[PDB]
Amino acid sequence: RSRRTEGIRAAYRRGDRGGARDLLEEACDQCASQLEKGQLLSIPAAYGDLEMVRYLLSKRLVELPTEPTDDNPAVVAAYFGHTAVVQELLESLPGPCSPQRLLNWMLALACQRGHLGVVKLLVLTHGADPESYAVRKNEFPVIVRLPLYAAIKSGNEDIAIFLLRHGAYFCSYILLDSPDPSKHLLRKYFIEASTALRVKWSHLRLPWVDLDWLIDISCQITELDLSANCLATLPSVIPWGLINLRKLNLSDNHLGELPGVQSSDEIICSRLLEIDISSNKLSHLPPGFLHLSKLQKLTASKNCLEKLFEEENATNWIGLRKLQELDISDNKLTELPALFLHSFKSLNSLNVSRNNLKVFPDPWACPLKCCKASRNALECLPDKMAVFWKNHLKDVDFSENALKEVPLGLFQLDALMFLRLQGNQLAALPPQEKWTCRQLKTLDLSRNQLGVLEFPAFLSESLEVLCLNDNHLDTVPPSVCLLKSLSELYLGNNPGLRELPPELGQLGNLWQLDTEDLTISNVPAEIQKEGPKAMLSYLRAQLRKAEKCKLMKMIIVGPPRQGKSTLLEILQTGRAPQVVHGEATIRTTKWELQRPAGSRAKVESVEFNVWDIGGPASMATVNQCFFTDKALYVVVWNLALGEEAVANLQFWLLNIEAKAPNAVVLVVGTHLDLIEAKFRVERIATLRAYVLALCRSPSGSRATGFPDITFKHLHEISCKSLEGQEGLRQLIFHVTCSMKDCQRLAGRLIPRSYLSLQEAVLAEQQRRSRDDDVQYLTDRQLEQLVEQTPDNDIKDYEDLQSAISFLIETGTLLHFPDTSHGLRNLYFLDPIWLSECLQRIFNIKGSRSVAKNGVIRAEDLRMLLVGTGFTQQTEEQYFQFLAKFEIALPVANDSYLLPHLLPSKPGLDTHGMRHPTANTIQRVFKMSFVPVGFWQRFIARMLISLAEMDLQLFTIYSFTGNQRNRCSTFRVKRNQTIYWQEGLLVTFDGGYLSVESSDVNWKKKKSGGMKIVCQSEVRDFSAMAFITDHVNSLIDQWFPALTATESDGTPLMEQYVPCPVCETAWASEDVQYFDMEDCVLTAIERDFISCPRHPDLPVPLQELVPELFMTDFPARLFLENSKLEHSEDEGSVLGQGGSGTVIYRARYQGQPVAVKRFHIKKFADTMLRHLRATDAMKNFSEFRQEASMLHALQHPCIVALIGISIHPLCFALELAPLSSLNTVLSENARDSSFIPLGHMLTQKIAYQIASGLAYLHKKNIIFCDLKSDNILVWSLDVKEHINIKLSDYGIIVYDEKVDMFSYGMVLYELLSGQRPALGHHQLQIAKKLSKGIRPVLGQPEEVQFRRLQALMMECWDTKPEKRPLALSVVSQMKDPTFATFMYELCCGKQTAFFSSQGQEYTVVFWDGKEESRNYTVVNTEKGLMEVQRMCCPGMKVSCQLQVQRSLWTATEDQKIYIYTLKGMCPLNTPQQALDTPAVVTCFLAVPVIKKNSYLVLAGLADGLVAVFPVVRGTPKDSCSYLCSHTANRSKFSIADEDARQNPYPVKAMEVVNSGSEVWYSNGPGLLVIDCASLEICRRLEPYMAPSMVTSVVCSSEGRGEEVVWCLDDKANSLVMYHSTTYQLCARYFCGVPSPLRDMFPVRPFSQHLQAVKILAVRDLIWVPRRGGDVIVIGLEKDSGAQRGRVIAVLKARELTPHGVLVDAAVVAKDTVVCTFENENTEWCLAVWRGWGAREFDIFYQSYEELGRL
C-alpha cells in the first residue's frame, strides 16, 4: 500500500516530473482519505513542485491539516525554504482562522534553518508571532523553540535583527545565554551616529542595562532613549558619568527610584538639557537635578510623587535656574514648595495639573506663558499675577478646583487670552471696571453657582467664545448681548432660564448656541426646531421692529393679444370690462385682495404690486428679464385656440422657470364664453389635462425643467359673464397665503429700516418722475437714501444687501447683477422707464447714412438718443446699461453695433471665398423654434469676439478650476468677413468658417436651425470650437428655454453631423446623419462609428467630430497609450482638480508624472444618454481650454505640460518629487521658530513665487488660488536652479491685487511656519481679513528678516492700491540688500561700544559716569538687550578685551581692571588691577598653543606696546613695554624731526601668519612684532603723514594665501600686503561715490564716503562707511594676475533715521553688526547676515541663471 509514496519519490529523484504527476494522480484516485491525501501532498512540497501543488489543491481538493507535524507539507516547505510553496499552501486554507500555531511552527523552524524569506513572508504577510513558543501537544516549552533566541543563537544576524525590529523582544535568556552577539547587535544597528551616537534602545523591553554595553562610547554619548521597558535600576554613570548627553527618555518603566551623585563635582554631564522620567513609580525626584545649571526641561509626570524634592533645605542649590518647563502633573502632590519654584527663573510653563494641591505655590517673578493647574483642590489664587506675570501669562486653567473667589489680578492679566474657571464653586466675578485682560479670546465659567455677572466693554472686540451653561442663571446676563465679536455661546442647562432676550440678536458673528434644556417663551417652538440660526434671525427681526409685510409681486404673462389687461381689469374691479387698453409694453398698478369667507389665512388681506407685461413680439426676449424669483406668475391664454395655444405655453412656462425657480405659477384660460356650454365639461377637462400633459412627466410628476404646475393651479374664466372670477381670486389668495420662503411670505417680518428704505426709494422715483430725471440709482445714491433713513440699522453693506434683496423681491427695485468693471453699480426704479428707453433705442430706424452695416457712429448715436436724458454726466451709465442688454455694443472706440440693425444678406462674392476642398467639417443645429432676436445677438457677439481676438493677436482670463470661460482655443488671424442678419462667412489664412440659417428638415422635422461649415487646410478646426462655445454661452445667458426638452422627453434643440461617406456615395436626400450625442459618447472609447447605411464601412470620428480629438494641436504633443503606465487605484491619487478631474500618480516612459484625467460618466435610456452626452461635451470643452492655456506657458516656475491623450481623456504634467510646499513647510515648522526652511532657501522660494506670478500676470493670466497647496517643491537644495513650480491643482472679482494678497499670505506662512490660523471657518476668516484683522508675526527683532516682513505686510494692506505689483517685488528681491539686512535694534543714549569674539557680551554699550556708570548687553541671536543699563560704577573706559573668563577694561586713569565673568552682572569688584604708563587705546589677545597661555598686547596712546602675559585668564605682573622709539632708533632710523615720531596712539592690532607675528599701527607706518621673541622686527609704510592706518585686518584666502588689508583714516584708501613676503600687493582708492562693480588690479557728501573700519567676513572684506553704504569686496584670478572687485553694495535705507554710522564689527561667524549714531548720541544697532563668497555667489547665480531662461 505505502509503496506508492516511494514511487513518487523515485519519480522526483530521477527528475521525472510527468511520471510523478501521473503516479500521484493515480494514488490520489486510490487515496480517498484526508490523511492519505495530506501524506501525498507532503511529497511535491518536499520536492518543491509549485505546479503539482496547484493541480493537487485545485482539482483533487486535498485538504491541508493544521497539525504542525513532520508530515505537514507547510512545515516541509518552510524547512527547505520554498517560499512560493509556503504561500500557496497557506493560501489554500479556507476561512479567516489563520493557523497561528502552524505559522509559529514554520517561523521557528525556518529561524533554526535560516530560510529568511519564509520568515519574512510569515511575519509580514501572515503575522506569525515572534514571541511565542512552538510546542506540540504533549510537549513542553523551551527557549530554543522561541524564534528570536534561536535566530541569534544560529549566528544569522540579519534574521535576528529583522525579528527584533518587527516584533521580537529581548529577555533574560538572550542576555544571559548569548551575551556577545546580543551586545554586538545592540551596539551596531541601533546607533544614530553624529562620538555623539544617539543610541535608541527603547521598546526592546530590556529587563536591565549595563554600562559595559556602551561605556566604550562614553566619550560624548552612549545612549539617550531608554524608555518602553521594565527597567528597575540604572548604572551609576547614566547620565552623570556621560559627558555630552543632552536629552534622556527614561520614562515608561519600573524605575521607581534613580541613582545619584554625592556632589556636583561628580556631574561630568553638566550640559544635559532634557529629562523625561515620567510614567514611573517615583515618590520624589532625585536631588541631583538641582545641581544641573544647564537643564532646560524636566517632565516627571505620571508618577506617585508626594514631594517635589527631598528636604535638603540646607544645600545651596544652584541647578534648574534656566528650567523653562516643569511637568509634575498626574501626581499626588499636596504642596509645591515655594523654595524651588522661586529658584526657577526661566520657567515658562508649570503643569501642576491633576494633583492634590490645595495651596497654589507662592507667586514669583518669572516669564510664565502658561499655568495648567487644573484638577486640583485649590482654595485661593495668588494675588501678584498681574504684578509678576502681567505681560507673559497667556493660557490659564484653574478649572475644576475648590475655588470660591478669584483676585482682581487674574482678570488684570494683559497677556491672558485663555481662561478656564469651570467646575468650581465661584459665586461672583470681580467688578468689570477693574479688568484689564483685553486679550480674552475664550472664557468658560460653566458649572458654577454664579449668576449679577457683568463684563467689560472692550471684551466685545476680543472675545470669541463664552460658556455660561449650567450655572445659577434664571436670566441671561444683559452684558452678554454686548459681545458683538462673540462666535460661540453656551446658555444651556439653565432650567430657570425661561426667556432668551432679544438683544442677543445684536451678536453679529454668533453662529453656535447650546440651547439644551431651555424653554424660550419669546421664541416660537418652530423657530427653535429650525435651529440656532433661525433663533438669531428671529431675534434680530424682533429687535429691529420688523413689520408684517403683506405686499407681494405678481406678473401677468402669456402670448400677445390674450386680454392680459382685461383679466387684470376684472380682477381689480370684479365687474364687466370698461377700459380701452393702449399700446404700452408694460403697465404697473396695485391691487388688494380680502380673505374669502372660510379662509384659514394668517392675514385679513393681501397686497399686490402688479406688472402687466406685453408689447410687440420684438421685445419678448428682453421682457423675460423682468421676471424675478419669489413672485406670483399668472400665465393667461385664450381657450378658443385650444391645443394650438396650449403648445405655445410651454415656451412661456420655461422662461418663467429659468428665472424664478421658486415661483408659484397659475395657468388660466379666458374666452370661456366662446366654448359651447354643453361640451365644456368634456372640452375643458380635456384641454386642462392636455396642458398638464405638456408640463408633467408620464408618471404624473413635474417634467424636469418646468415649473411645478399641478391640477389645483388651473382655472377657467370669462370676461363678459365673469364666470369664476370669484373662484380665480380665491385661488390667487389661497396660493398667495400658501406661498412660503421660514414662515409664509405674505405678512413675513421685514425689518423696519427696510420698509423705510422702500418708502424712500419710492419717494426718489416720484421725485425723478416730477423732475423728468432718469431712473438710474447708483450705489452712491442708494447709500445716500439709506443714510437719510430714520431708524437706520444699516451699518455694514451686508445689511443693505439683504435690504436690496427684499426690495427686488417686493417689486420696488430692478437689478441685473453683472460685476464686470463695476457694472453692478446700478439699480432701476421703474419698469416703464426701462422698457420705454429700450423700445426707443430699438426703434432707431437709421438709414444707410446712419447704420453702416449695423454700427452707428458714437456721436450720431449720442444725438439720436436725446429724449431720455442722455446728458454727458450720465452717458457712461446708459452704455454700461446698454452693453449689458446687448442693445448697443462698443465697436473699437469709433461706433456702436446695434444687433437689430444688421443688413440683409448682401449680394457679395460668397462663391470665390468658399473652398471646394476635402478638409470639410459640417454641423447642423435643429431647433423646434427660433427665439426672437437670437440670430442678431449670436452674430453680434461672435463678430465682437473676432474683433477682440484680432486685437489680441498684436482681457478676462483665469487659471485653475473655475466657472470663468474664455475661448483661448481660437487664436486665428481674421482675413475678411461678410456678415448679415441670418449668417456670416469669416475667412482666414488657410480656411474659413460659415454659419447660416438653414431649412433643417431631418426626418420630415421641418423646423428652424442652422448649418455650420468649417474648412482648414492645416487640420486646424478651432473654429468649430469657437462656434460651439458662442452657441452654448448665448443659449445659457439669453435663451435658457432651449436647454430643455418637451414633457415627453423630446429635445427642443438637437445637433447632428452629416455623414461624409453617404455624401461621397451620392456625390437631394436626407443624407444619413449622426446624432452628436452618440458621436461624442462613442468618441469616448472607439475610433470608428458605423453608419446605418454602411454597417460594414465604419467612418473615423477624427473626420467627423475632430474638435473632440484636438486635431489642431502639434503632433509632438500627443502621448502614446502603450507607453503610459496609468493607475486608477485609490493610492495613486495625487490630488483633485477644480473641475471634478483627478490628478493621478502615473509613469510615462519610466518617468514619474501627474496625469490630470477627466471622469465623464455619472451612471438605452434616452434621458441618461442626453445627460451623459452633455457632460461629455462640457468636459471636452474644459479639456480643450485647459490644454490650450497650458500649452502657451513656458517659464522655469510654471508646471509644464508633457503631452495629451484622448483614450482616456487625460493629459500629463511633470510630477513633484517632494509634494507641495505645504508638506515640507509644515513638517519643518514644528521644531523651529521662524524661517523653518532656512534663510537662503526661504529667499529662493519667495523669489521663485514672485517670478512665477510676474510671468503669469504678464500673460494676462490670473491665479486666484495661490496657496501653499498649489505650490510644488522639487528640491530643498539651494544650489539647484529651480526649486518650486506653480501648479494648477492642490494636494467674486479678481485682479492682480488679489493674487498679491494671496502671495503675502504665502509669505506669512513661509516666515511663521504656521498657516494664517484666523479660524477653521472660511467665512469668519474672510470677515476678519476684510475688516483689517491680520495674523500676528513677531517683531523684526525675532524674525531677523526685516525687508521681506515689510513686503509681506505691504501685500495684505486693506487698500489694493498700496499692494505692490509682481514686477516690483521681483525687482526688490533682485538686490542683495533685500536678504542681507536682518533687522535693527535701537539702544538709545550711550557713551561707548565694544564688540567681542562672540562668546559672551556679544555686543555691549556703556554710559554714565562714576556712580551712574552703567552698561547694556545685547545678544544678536535673540535681538534682545539681555542686560539693560545695569549699574557698574567707576571711571569710563576706552577699550576692553574679554577672553577665556576674564575681561580687561582700560580706564582713562592709566589702569587696566581685570574682572572675571563669574561675577555675572555686577562686575564692580575687579579680580586684578594693573597700572599703565599711559591710557591704552586698544587691545589684542593672541594665544600660544605651545605654552597654553595668551598674550594681551595693549596699544597705548603714545605708540608704545605693552605685553601682558596671561595664563588661563590670569594676568601676570611681569609685563614688558616694547618701545616704538627704541625700534626706530635701532633699525628703522627715521629722523627725529620727522612727524613719524609724534607719539601717535595705537589704533590697530592684528595677528598675522597664524599668530606668528602681530601687526599694529604707528602713524602712517605699521610695525610687526615677533610673537616668539617679542622683539619689533619690521616696519612698513602704506601711507605718509598726516595719514595713519586706522585698522589692520588679515584673513585666509581660498587658495591658502594669507594677506593683510589696511585702511587709511585720511586718504580713505585700502591697501593690501602679503603676510609672508611683506610687499604692498594692491592699492585701492575707496572714496568712490558709486562703487558699482569697481575693479582694480592686484600684483602676483564727502563725509558719507569715508570708510570707518575693515571687517573680515568669512572670505570677503566688508568696508562700511559713514553714509551707511557698505561695500563687500573680494578678489578673482585672471590669467595669473589677481583683481580685487566689489561683489555687492549694500545699504539699508531704513537705517537713515538713526543718523550716521559710528562704527561696525564682526560679532559672530555668520553675523555682522554696525552702530549708527545721531546728533543726540543715541545709537541703533543694524545687523547684516554674515555672507561669504559662497552666499553672494549662489545668490547672484540663482538670479542670473533664472534670468537666462
Ligand SMILES: Nc1nc2c(ncn2[C@@H]2O[C@H](COP(=O)(O)OP(=O)(O)O)[C@@H](O)[C@H]2O)c(=O)[nH]1
Ligand atoms: N369674449 C371674450 N373676449 C376676451 C376675453 N378675454 C379677452 N378678450 C378679448 O381680448 C381683447 C383684449 O386683449 P389685450 O388687452 O389687447 O391683450 P394684451 O395683448 O395682453 O394686451 C379684448 O378686445 C377682449 O374682447 C374673454 O374671456 N372673453
